[PDB]
Amino acid sequence: AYAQWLADXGPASXVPPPS
Numbered sequence: 230a231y232a233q234w235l236a237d238x239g240p241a242s243x244v245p246p247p248s
Contacts, residue, residue: 230247
């Protein structure tokens with residue numbers, strides 16, 4: 230989940246990282 234978040238762009242995409 231977290232790894233995918235980074236692939237989407239992370240903070241740049243405008244999405245909160247999954248915890």
